[PDB]
C-alpha cells in the first residue's frame, strides 16, 4: 500500500490527519475535496500533496458542526460555491489605492470592488467567524478569501452581474445590526400620523433618495388610503446609514458623505466606480485613481456616518 499524510478541514482551523491511498482519488476516500479552491475530487494524490490542507464537504457530525460554527450555514452547496469563487479570486490583484484595498478589474468584479472599498469605511461586525476573519485579512491587503465568501453568501458566481445595494443588503444580514433602530413618522391628511420602528438591516438602508438631509425633512410616499403622505426620520441609532436610488446625476460635496457608488450604463451590464470623501474627493475605478475638489455624476448609493439622531420637527 502506497500512502501520503494530509490534513482535511471545513474551516481551515480544526485540521484532521488522514492517511490517503495514492492509487485512489480524493473523492473515493473523502467525498468532494478542494486544494486552494481547485476541485481535486477526481484527482489522485501527487507526492507534492504530502502534509497539505484539503477542504472536504462535511460527512460526519463533527464536520457539520464545525462548518456551521465557522460559516453560519448548513447549505451543503456552500463549500463548493466558495471554492469555485476562490479559484478565480486568488488570481485577482488587490492593489492599495488611497489607503484602501481595491480590486484590479476582472470577471465583471466592479460591484465587488465597490462593496469591498465601502466595507473598509463603515463600522460592521460579521456574525460568521469566516467573514470576520476574512474581512480583517482583506483590510490588511489579502482580500481573495473575503471576495470568494461574499460571492458564496450572495449566491453569485464569478462573472455574474451584481448590484452593490443587494450585495451590501446580504452582507448586513450576516452582521450584528441588532442595536440599529430607525423611527419613522408618516403624515397623511386622512389616516393622520403613524410611527413605525425598524431594526437591523431595515434600520440602515433606504431606497428612494440619496440625500440623508432630504430623508430628515421628509419625502413624498403613497398612503394606503389613496393619498400621498410624508415619511420623515424621527430617530436614527446606527454607526452609518445607506441611502440608494436609481442612478441619476447627483452632486457630491467634500465632507458631507463618507463614500458613494457611481453607476454608468444600462440596467445590469453597466460599470460601478467608488467615490470617497477624504481631504478631497477620490474616484477609485478598480486599480485606477483620480481626484477632484468637486463631483457631479451618476450616483445610486451614498453612505453617511451616524451615532444617534433625533429630529426637532
Ligand atoms: C448592476 C446590477 C446587477 C443586477 C441587477 N439586478 C441590477 C443592477 C443595476 O443595474 N443596478 C443599478 C444600480 C440600478 C438599480 C436600480 C435601478 C436602475 C435603473 C436603471 C439603471 C440601473 C439601475
Ligand atoms: Cl474543520
Ligand atoms: Cl446564523
Ligand atoms: Cl480569474
Ligand atoms: Cl449570520
Ligand atoms: Zn474536527
Ligand atoms: Zn449567523
Ligand atoms: Zn476568472
Ligand atoms: Zn391615510
Author numbering: 2 to 314
Paper text:
There are two distinctive cysteine proteases encoded by the SARS-CoV-2 genome that are essential to the virus proliferation cycle: papain-like protease (PLpro, a domain within Nsp3, EC 3.4.22.46) and chymotrypsin-like main protease (3CLpro or Mpro, corresponding to Nsp5, EC 3.4.22.69). Nevertheless, PLpro is a multifunctional protein having an essential role in processing of viral polyproteins, maturation, and assembly of the RTC, and it also may act on the host cell proteins by disrupting host viral response machinery to facilitate viral proliferation and replication. Briefly, the protein has two distinct domains: the small N-terminal ubiquitin-like (Ubl) domain and the “thumb–palm–fingers” catalytic domain. The palm subdomain is comprised of six β-strands with the catalytic residues Cys111, His272, and Asp286 located at the interface between the thumb and palm subdomains.
One of these compounds (1/GRL0617) was identified previously as a specific SARS-CoV PLpro inhibitor, and showed good potency and low cytotoxicity in SARS-CoV-infected Vero E6 cells. Given that compound 1/GRL0617 is known to inhibit SARS-CoV PLpro with an IC50 value of 0.6 μM33, we expected it would likely inhibit the SARS-CoV-2 enzyme and indeed it does so, with an IC50 value of 2.3 μM in our assay conditions. The structures of complexes with inhibitors 1, 2, and 3 were determined at 1.95–2.30 Å, including compound 3 in both wild-type and mutant forms. All three ligands bind to the same site in the enzyme located 8–10 Å away from the catalytic cysteine and it is expected that all seven synthetic compounds bind in a very similar manner. Considerable conformational adjustments are observed for the side chains of residues involved in ligand binding. These inhibitors bind to protease S4/S3 sites. The S4 site is where specificity of the LXGG sequence recognition motif is determined as it recognizes leucine side chain by fitting it into hydrophobic pocket. This site is only partly conserved between SARS-CoV and MERS-CoV enzymes explaining lack of cross reactivity of compound 1 reported previously. The inhibitory effect of compounds 1, 2, 3, and 4 can be easily rationalized as they anchor to the site. Although somewhat away from the catalytic triad, their binding still interferes with the recognition of peptide motif LXGG. In the structures with inhibitors there are additional zinc and chloride ions bound, including one in the active site that is coordinated by the active site Cys111.
